[model samples]
Target: SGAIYVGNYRVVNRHLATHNDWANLVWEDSSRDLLVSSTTAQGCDTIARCDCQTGVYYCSSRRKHYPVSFSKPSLIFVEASEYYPARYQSHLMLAVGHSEPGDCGGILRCQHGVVGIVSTGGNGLVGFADVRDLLWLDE
Candidate 1:
């Protein structure tokens, strides 16, 4: 019943798995401000797509795109229940960098093709934003 964070934004319904060619989630800060309510509009142009058959994930911006293959964790911890409360928590993986020019500079965390987090570096080589710890909310 709760929303999840995909990068710095809290994902909205259109961006959920139910929609085709939907945009990514809306951006909100730690205080939980809805996109509509905020005075600032980020105008998100990022999109994430997955090929279910191939088990691959792709994230793209206006200028570049990145792809990551399926990878799963070998172990499941009880503590994960606290972070990922949703059922069927498989395909929890992270992908960093891509071969595309200027595309291999961001980070993505996904759950079963559903992106949960994303970040990009200022330069292709260093200091990409790190949202690894912000994928889930704190209890």
Candidate 2:
């Protein structure tokens, strides 16, 4: 699995609201040399890694925190096309969540040739809120 760290402020507060909303991929800040992405808590600037990668905005928050009993990285792909896919816009956001080591949480195979823990859309996933934030590059 890939290296999973605590999510940043914007990511945790805005993207991963519940245990179900953790992030999958990670990107580091070249200057600070710290891994920057949504985590169970905290982030760089006022945005989550997902937002920065996709070039979007995020809501306001104080800091990030581990929202659940454990911490894990979850990823959802956002298509960079003219129209967002129904899967992301309607389904995956609400239903998808972080993958637990054994609780049927989501998992991912990263492009860096590493597998990591992440969240998957549960059957309950619904609405545009969940998918709208992610950018297409991350997908």
Largest lDDT belongs to which candidate? 1
Q: Give the Cα error of residue 91 in candidate 1, in Å.
A: 6.5
Please list the C-alpha lDDT of all candidates, in the order they appear.
Answer: 0.29, 0.26
Tens-place lDDT per residue, model 2, 78-129, is 3332222322222122222223212212222222211222323234321122
24-125 per-residue lDDT for model 1 (tens digits):
333433211112111123433233343332123233444444445433321222122222332332223333343222332233434443333332123221
Q: Which residues of candidate 1, in runs, are more than 4 Å off?
A: 1-39, 52-68, 72-91, 94-106, 109-114, 118-139
* Model 2, TM vs. native: 0.19
Candidate 1 versus truth, CA RMSD in Å, comes to 13.2
TM-score, cand. 1:
0.24
* All candidates: TM-score: 0.24, 0.19
